Amino acid sequence: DYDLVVVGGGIVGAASAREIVLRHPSLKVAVLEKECKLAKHQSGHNSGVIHAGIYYKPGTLKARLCVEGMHLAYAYLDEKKIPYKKTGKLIVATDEKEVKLLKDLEKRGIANNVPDLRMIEGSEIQEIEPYCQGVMALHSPHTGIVDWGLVTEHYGQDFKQCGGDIYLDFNVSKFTETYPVTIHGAKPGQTVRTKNVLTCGGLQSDLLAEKTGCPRDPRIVPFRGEYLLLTKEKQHMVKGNIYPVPDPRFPFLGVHFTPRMDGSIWLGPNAVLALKREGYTWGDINLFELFDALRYPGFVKMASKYIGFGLSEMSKSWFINLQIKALQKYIPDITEYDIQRGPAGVRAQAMDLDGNLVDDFVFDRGQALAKVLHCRNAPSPGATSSLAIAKMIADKIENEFSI
Amino acid sequence: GDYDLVVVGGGIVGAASAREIVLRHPSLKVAVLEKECKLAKHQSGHNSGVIHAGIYYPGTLKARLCVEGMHLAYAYLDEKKIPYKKTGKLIVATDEKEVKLLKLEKRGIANNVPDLRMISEIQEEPYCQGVALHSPHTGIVDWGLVTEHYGQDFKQCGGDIYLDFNVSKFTETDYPVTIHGAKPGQTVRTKNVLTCGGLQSDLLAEKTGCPRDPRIVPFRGEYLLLTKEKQHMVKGNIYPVPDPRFPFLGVHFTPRMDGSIWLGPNAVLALKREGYTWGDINLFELFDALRYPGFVKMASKYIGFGLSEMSKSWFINLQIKALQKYIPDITEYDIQRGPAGVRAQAMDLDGNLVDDFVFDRGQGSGALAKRVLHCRNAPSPGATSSLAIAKMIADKIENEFSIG
Amino acid sequence: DYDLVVVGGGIVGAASAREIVLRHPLKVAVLEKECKLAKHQSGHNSGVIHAGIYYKPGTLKARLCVEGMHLAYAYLDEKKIPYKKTGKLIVATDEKEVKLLKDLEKRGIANNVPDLRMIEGSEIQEIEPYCQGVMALHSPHTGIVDWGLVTEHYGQDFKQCGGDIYLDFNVSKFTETTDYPVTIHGAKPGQTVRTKNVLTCGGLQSDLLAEKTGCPRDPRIVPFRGEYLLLTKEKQHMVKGNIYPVPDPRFPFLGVHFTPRMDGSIWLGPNAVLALKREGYTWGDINLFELFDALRYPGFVKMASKYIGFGLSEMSKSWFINLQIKALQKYIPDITEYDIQRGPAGVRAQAMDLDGNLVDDFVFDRGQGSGALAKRVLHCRNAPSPGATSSLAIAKMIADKIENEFSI
Amino acid sequence: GDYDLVVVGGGIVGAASAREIVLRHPSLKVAVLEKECKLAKHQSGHNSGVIHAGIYYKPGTLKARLCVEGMHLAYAYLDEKKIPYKKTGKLIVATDEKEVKLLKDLEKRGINNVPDLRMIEGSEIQEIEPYCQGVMALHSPHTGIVDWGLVTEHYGQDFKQCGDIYLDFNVSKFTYPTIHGAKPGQTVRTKNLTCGGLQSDLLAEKTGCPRDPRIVPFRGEYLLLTKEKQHMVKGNIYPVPDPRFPFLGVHFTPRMDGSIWLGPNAVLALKREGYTWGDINLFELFDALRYPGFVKMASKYIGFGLSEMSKSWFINLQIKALQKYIPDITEYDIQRGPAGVRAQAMDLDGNLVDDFVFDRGAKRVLHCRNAPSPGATSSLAIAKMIADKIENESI
Ligand SMILES: Cc1cc2nc3c(=O)[nH]c(=O)nc-3n(C[C@H](O)[C@H](O)[C@H](O)COP(=O)(O)OP(=O)(O)OC[C@H]3O[C@@H](n4cnc5c(N)ncnc54)[C@H](O)[C@@H]3O)c2cc1C
Ligand SMILES: Cc1cc2nc3c(=O)[nH]c(=O)nc-3n(C[C@H](O)[C@H](O)[C@H](O)COP(=O)(O)OP(=O)(O)OC[C@H]3O[C@@H](n4cnc5c(N)ncnc54)[C@H](O)[C@@H]3O)c2cc1C
Ligand SMILES: Cc1cc2nc3c(=O)[nH]c(=O)nc-3n(C[C@H](O)[C@H](O)[C@H](O)COP(=O)(O)OP(=O)(O)OC[C@H]3O[C@@H](n4cnc5c(N)ncnc54)[C@H](O)[C@@H]3O)c2cc1C
Ligand SMILES: Cc1cc2nc3c(=O)[nH]c(=O)nc-3n(C[C@H](O)[C@H](O)[C@H](O)COP(=O)(O)OP(=O)(O)OC[C@H]3O[C@@H](n4cnc5c(N)ncnc54)[C@H](O)[C@@H]3O)c2cc1C
Ligand SMILES: CCCCCCCCCCCCO[C@@H]1O[C@H](CO)[C@@H](O[C@H]2O[C@H](CO)[C@@H](O)[C@H](O)[C@H]2O)[C@H](O)[C@H]1O
Ligand SMILES: CCCCCCCCCCCCO[C@@H]1O[C@H](CO)[C@@H](O[C@H]2O[C@H](CO)[C@@H](O)[C@H](O)[C@H]2O)[C@H](O)[C@H]1O
Ligand SMILES: CCCCCCCCCCCCO[C@@H]1O[C@H](CO)[C@@H](O[C@H]2O[C@H](CO)[C@@H](O)[C@H](O)[C@H]2O)[C@H](O)[C@H]1O
Ligand SMILES: CCCCCCCCCCCCO[C@@H]1O[C@H](CO)[C@@H](O[C@H]2O[C@H](CO)[C@@H](O)[C@H](O)[C@H]2O)[C@H](O)[C@H]1O
DSSP, rough: OOEEEEEEEEEEHHHHHHHHHHHTTOOOEEEOOOOSSSSSGGSSSSSEEEOOEEEEEEEESHHHHHHHHHHHHHHHHHHHHHOOOOOOOEEESSSHHHHHHHHHHHHHHTTTTTTTOOOETSSSSHHHHHOOOOOOEEOEEEEEEEOOOHHHHHHHHHHHHOOOOOEEEEOEEEEEHHHHEEEOOOSTTTTEESSEEEEGGGGGGHHHHTTTTSSSEEEEEEEEEOOOOOOOOGGGGGSSEEEEEETSSSSSOSSSSEOTTTTEEEEEEEOOOOOSSSSSSSEEEEEEHHHHHHHHHHHHHHHHHHHHHHHHHHHHSSHHHHHHHHHTTTTOOOOGGGGEEEEEEEEEEEOOTTTOOOOOOEOOOOOOOOOOEEEOOOSSSSTTTHHHHHHHHHHHHHHHOOO | OSSSSSEEEESSHHHHHHHHHHHHOTTOOEEEEEEESSSOSSGSSSSSSEOOOOOOOOSSHHHHHHHHHHHHHHHHHHHHTTOOOOEEEEEEOEEEHHHHHHHHHHHHTTTTTOHHHHOEEEOOOOHHHOOEEETOOOOEEEHHHHHHHHHHHHHHHTTTETTTTTOOOEEOOOOOOOOOOSSOOOOEESSSSOOOOOHHHHHHTTTTOOOOOOOEEEEEEEEEEGGGGGGOOOSSSSOOOTTTTTTTOEEEEEETSSSSSEEOOOOESSSTTOOSSEEEHHHHHHHHHHHHHHHHHHHHHHHHHHHHHHHHHHHHHHHEEEEEEEESSOOSSSSSEEEEEEEEEEEESSOOBBOOOOEEEEESOOOOSSEEEEEOOOOOTTTHHHHHHHHHHHHHHHHHHHHH | EEEEEEEOSSSSHHHHHHHHHHHOOOOEEOOSSSEEEEEESSSOOOOEEEESSSSSSSSSHHHHHHHHHHHHHHHHHHTTTEEEEOOOOEOOOOOOHHHHHHHHHHHHHHHHTTTOEEEEEHHHHOOOOOOOOOEEEETTTTTOOOHHHHHHHHHHHHTTTTEEOOOOOOEEEEOOOOOOOOOEESTTTTOEEEEEEEEEEEGGGHHHTTTTTTSOOOOOEEEEEEEEEEGGGGGGGGSSEEEEEETTTTSSSSSSEEETTTTSSEEEEEOOOOOOOOHHHHHHHSEEHHHHHHHHHHHHHHHHHHHHHHHHHHHHHHHHHHHHHHHHTTTTTOOOOOGOOOEEEEEEEEEEEETBBBBBSEEEEEESSSSHHHHHHEEEEOOOTTTTTTTHHHHHHHHHHHHHHHTT | OOEEEEEEEEEEHHHHHHHHHHOOTTTOOEEEOSSSSSSOTTTTSSSEEEEEOOSSOOOHHHHHHHHHHHHHHHHHHHHTTTTOOOOOOOOOOHHHHHHHHHHHHHHHHHHHOOSSEEEEEETGGGGGGTTTTOOOOEEEOOOOOOOOHHHHHHHHHHHTOOOOEEOOOEEEEEEOOOOSSSSSEEEOOOOOBBOOOTHHHHTTTTTTTTTTTTEEEEEEEEEEEOOTTTTTSOBBBOOOOTTTOOOOOOOOOOOTTTTTOOOOOOEEETTTTSSSEEEEEEEEEHHHHSHHHHHHHHHHHHHHHHHHHHHOOOHHHHHHHHTOOOOOOOOGGGGGEEEEEEEEEEESSSSSSSSEEEOOOOOOOOOEEEESSOOTTTTTHHHHHHHHHHHOOOO
């Protein structure tokens, strides 16, 4: 019924299916999503920041796609008239040990050609954020905030305006050979036949790849990202984004202060090991989803080296008074009575056999069903670089299937 | 939009109640809010699918609603032209004590289950044995499809079904109550509210002012699928003689409209409200069910019964020794594990399992109170008695909400 | 240093050591890890002296019981050890239990149990006026005793003939050095004992000690806690003797029985609950090393495949004692939950093969090869039930087994 | 009726008090009731055997008063009875400039009338420990190595030679107005204290004392350095610990037999006598976790306690911290050794008790629920304080 279908209604799958039919309008492209609407998981529960590209090492792939995607996104928001607020980004250092890291993020950010990056001292910190302390800060006024869930839906809008079809409530559960390939949903009779596919399963990147002939690695390890909602009384204390100086050994950016479109400013997210693939709450646990997460060889290797950082993140979440004490190192005007537990997101972090966290493209196919391409990982961050990542995925697909 | 009445629940009880209230009053502006993407996505979409004739329940309301609902169901199935098969039920006894309990025959004759005969005798079910009761008016149907037709009739009467509407907060506003969904900006204004939340009967009732009791204790009903190489060994429904102390009818043989033979369901306590799998655990929803005062009181009396259900689930080989008492030519190789349903069992603070109607509301004569009525439980079988209990739910809200 | 070492100060190890020194007046020592002898199974038992009623006629388990019973009474009177000889009344609950009790009557008189006599009706009131039932089986020769006190007398006779008892000696390792090739190391540093041959009756650790020589993991020791209930002193007059239920013949467990102790107390038990620890006498005692290994045993998965229902039954009645009372009221109905109290417990050293069966026979095992430790250290990994009553008979069997394995 | 005074607990505290009591009044009928077979089978038998100089303790405090006095009393007792010991330096070593500040406060608090407190510079470090690095350090040569289990046996040896140690006596309930044991018939009546280490809270509840202060077991795990490199550690090597906790941190310490133990750490034991990780007790966890003060301390000190468990789960991380002192140790050079359990008392607000705590019901009983640290070196000094409190409550 179709030529190629994209499995995944996330911002990556929507932007890829959009980009491929814009350049090739003669291709019947469909999209299968297991949920009611688009961007229900990662791209629907994010902090909503358009990143400038500072943390990523120059000359790498992630440093190029982020800077290119940040300009492609801003140009896309004006064409579609999507609301967005360009607020300041302050990477504030609190002691003499973090400014050395801040000085590395300084030279690393300038090499990526981020627009108008300045390094302010403690005197000018209140000039951008009057309520924030710090020894030194890094100001990136080009960063902005946007609802990536609305951005994801606008991708699907332009997708089917060119002839696409978005099949929502379609839980892909099996691939069969009959248009040679055939896709089967969770409901009986719900089936779609095509020639090739391209999956962007996000949190189920590996499980979709296990139903074609790909190995278990790289396994998707769920990391919950919890947020705290500051009360409306003190929303004026944060004008823009206030980021901390993170540990460069991990891709996590740490809990930060971030405003949103609805005037709400949120505190987060953290790095909490989710005991469930879609474990948005701490109580929700799946025994089968962690027996494999524990029997995975790479998990024991990462835990052998980085168990202390994951447990202290879980410590600051068990007792939020510890998290407040950390946030007071930046804005000491916030107490435990000025916040309340909000929603959270889960990160689909890839992991190899050695325990490293993957931050690179991971395409895989079977060893008819083989030669079905699975995008098991995309470079961070997937939201800002979405349009740039889409073009790169729109190049891998045309050589794997000859379009 | 603004409405007169709002029904929270896309199940067979919420849809039939919403369908009944608009047929009696076509001038009403009634809406339906369902948190899932389709009607009958839980209990009404994960059931055995057999239409009961009320042979186990006389003089009460459940025995009247089931037989009346069974007659109204066959009339609705023929009017809307929905496929159904009169498979017939065969309640077989095995031991000598089960013969005394089956002599269930007197209660079924009083309830006027038509063509009820005490049978064992012969295999005129060929492969079934044992030392029985036949009622050929018991049939099977897709109750999930029946629920969709209730929504089709409700939409044809001017009603709107809001899907993906996860009700999360009732606040005060001509339409003095407003309803908040999960997504920001999802708002519906109404005058009076009726909730049929099924597995979330108590949680929805808590957002108005109702007490914790009765609590909804999840009981997962796992099913085993007899493979196609032996589906011919069961022609109609073959039920065992159950313990009258529990509403669970025990693991039974039941054919489906697609020709498959399903074996079940059992009674395994789910570690989650929507725990359809054995491993899915919600520590919050688990601790509250156990810390509920009525749970330990019920566990102190019948935990051995629930443990044998779990043991037959952990080791399937123990389950077939029971099934071999009815059909001995079934091995461990002829069956596979299938899907499951979770029962919204209501339980009081004393431990007794609720089986009657439970309507609850607020207290202090406010706006959220008196205008939001919660159906915390409906008599079983809910699917078969759906058209029957919908008439009594419509009568309840007509009195409670004053409708013309 | 010594010619023979018997590790384990239980009733089986002390009887074998006492027997082996009387026949060969040999430098033999006894190593016990605990403070005193009979600190486990020999000191945490029902204290009943059985006659061969339940056991198969003509088998070794049935011969040893009546042989050890007659040897015990002769030994109790010889050493002036206090013992009370009441009766064991096995009552049937329903007609289905009358069929099993009829077989136990024929199975008991075949092994010469003096003197079996079936009773029924109002005759049950003549022996126990508070207990009911359809039919019963009377055994006037069944008595009670302090098996822990009996075990200490075995070591008393063992020391009265030149034997040395090593207390607080936790055997940790078996190494080789001659003339005494095998030395035995303890938990404390420097504590060592050299010997020519070693015999191990470790009870709950018979498989762990055998693993330190070269013996396989099977048969594994699976701990089964046996909890007791204390009948209040206000109703201890309601039971005059031993009231036993007819047990399932598939399991060696005799079932929760009414049993008086010689201090006047009436204990109701024991049950058969799986222990989360080899020496887990309480409900909360959990050792993850011993828990996560009893589950990884191949026989444990096979045994639970067929008898998990009987085990969860025992556990459910252990969590809610009201269920246990409803079972005991089928015999003496005037007992309620207010008339009981949680008491101490014992742990059975139940051996299990790889197929899941509970072995109840003699299991001797030595190391592999012609080395020093493999040919001089013999492990008794299981003894026939009951080890306490059959102690004198088991000791003679073990003594003959040692006389052949080591040529003394 | 048999004895006049009964000391429940045969640890180093119970043995020293019973020994001190009979020397003052040789006419008293005194007995010691120990649950285990030998004396010093628990806390006193499972320690680093260090005679503490007393450098961490604030001046003018009671803990600093008994430590400096008990250390001198212990050195006189070891020579009087000819007990083997070795006087090696402790050498408090620092790392970064942030650790030098706390090391400077340790030198000021010590100069508590500590003897011969010299501050090593850096090049002189190799003259005391040639394999240890660091920036600055604080030396004190009169610290000692000792078998505290051997000393406890000598305390009871004198007590038994001055007029009875009842071993295997698990004191159960209470009834010369009777002390019951675990075995039926095991009895002994007295006219007048308990010093149970990990059970001072449970013994007090047998006569009507409140649950507070509770005893929270903290397992102290040790690591045995390989015998092939048992020469890199000549004396003690202690890190600069966080002053908010009584734990001195994992340290290098040699034993009488030449072995060197690395530790102990502070890992929450899941059992009162939980000497290994897998040994847990559910009843003793609903005790500690449901305790009101435990949640208060956990809400403030969970991060430090979680990293301790992380270093215990993976020695991978533990040696990475030890290499900051001597960097010539690998993973194959270490091996998991034995451990001890700390009888840390905790009040209802979460604070860790560090002073004397005596509580009675009902009048003839007196439970020393806690004693100042370190109880091993302060054994003779603390015993003098316990003997003064029991004489007043009218010997
Ligand atoms: C807490 C959090 C905060 C973040 N904040 C930011 C930020 O501030 N800025 C930024 O640039 N990035 C941010 N990100 C990253 C960004 O959200 C993700 O990188 C991006 O959404 C990845 O796109 P995706 O489509 O792969 O994710 P997803 O949206 O999760 O894509 C997966 C989709 O596939 C569907 N699916 C899965 N399995 C199947 C199946 N079998 N059949 C059919 N459909 C299936 C899922 O339902 C889902 O819709 C954040 C991520 C997290 C977790
Ligand atoms: C395993 C099993 C087998 C059964 N077999 C039979 C049989 O053979 N024959 C028979 O007659 N009966 C049978 N039944 C009974 C029958 O299925 C139920 O009685 C019936 O489905 C009850 O109707 P309901 O509306 O409560 O269903 P439900 O679907 O459970 O109704 C609850 C609905 O409300 C929605 N909801 C909950 N909370 C919210 C919220 N906050 N906001 C919005 N929506 C919300 C849920 O998504 C759901 O759609 C069976 C039941 C079970 C569990
Ligand atoms: C609850 C219960 C009730 C019973 N009731 C009865 C009854 O009524 N009548 C009856 O006849 N029988 C009864 N028995 C059975 C009888 O008690 C046992 O069969 C018998 O006690 C076991 O003898 P043993 O010598 O093997 O025992 P144990 O006493 O268990 O012997 C093991 C000994 O080995 C020692 N040991 C272990 N490892 C080492 C080591 N490394 N170094 C040194 N020493 C070590 C232990 O300390 C211990 O003392 C009962 C058993 C139980 C559990
Ligand atoms: C890991 C660790 C390392 C240490 N290192 C050092 C060090 O280097 N230097 C230093 O000076 N100090 C050190 N200490 C401190 C010192 O070892 C202890 O503080 C000291 O032993 C406490 O004395 P105690 O008698 O109360 O202890 P314990 O020896 O525990 O005394 C309690 C005794 O009473 C018995 N008992 C308990 N309940 C009962 C009962 N009901 N009936 C009968 N008997 C009972 C117990 O069996 C035990 O023998 C260390 C402590 C620990 C835990
Ligand atoms: C499964 C077990 C293994 C777990 C896997 C490994 C997980 C690793 C997660 C690393 C921690 C998350 O990322 C971490 O966030 C914290 C908290 O914001 C940052 O912390 C930083 O900012 C916070 C406030 O925001 C300051 O109080 C803090 O002093 C500073 O270090 C770290 O710089 C960053 O490294
Ligand atoms: C607090 C939580 C603890 C659990 C609470 C109590 C839960 C009670 C569970 C009841 C068990 C389910 O319901 C029970 O099903 C079993 C097994 O199908 C039926 O059992 C019947 O049919 C089976 C075959 O299916 C026959 O082998 C059996 O001999 C017969 O009794 C029981 O008659 C019925 O009572
Ligand atoms: C870990 C997985 C495996 C679990 C282990 C399974 C072990 C098997 C358990 C056997 C149970 C103990 O042994 C069992 O005791 C019970 C209770 O006393 C006896 O039961 C008998 O007496 C009791 C009262 O005492 C009566 O209420 C009962 O009707 C009668 O049958 C059984 O006849 C006997 O079989
Ligand atoms: C129950 C949950 C809460 C747990 C309760 C609170 C437990 C508190 C324990 C704190 C940790 C133990 O004590 C802590 O030991 C560590 C490790 O040795 C010391 O750490 C010090 O020495 C180590 C080496 O040993 C160095 O690598 C480290 O850089 C240095 O800081 C800390 O200075 C001390 O504070």
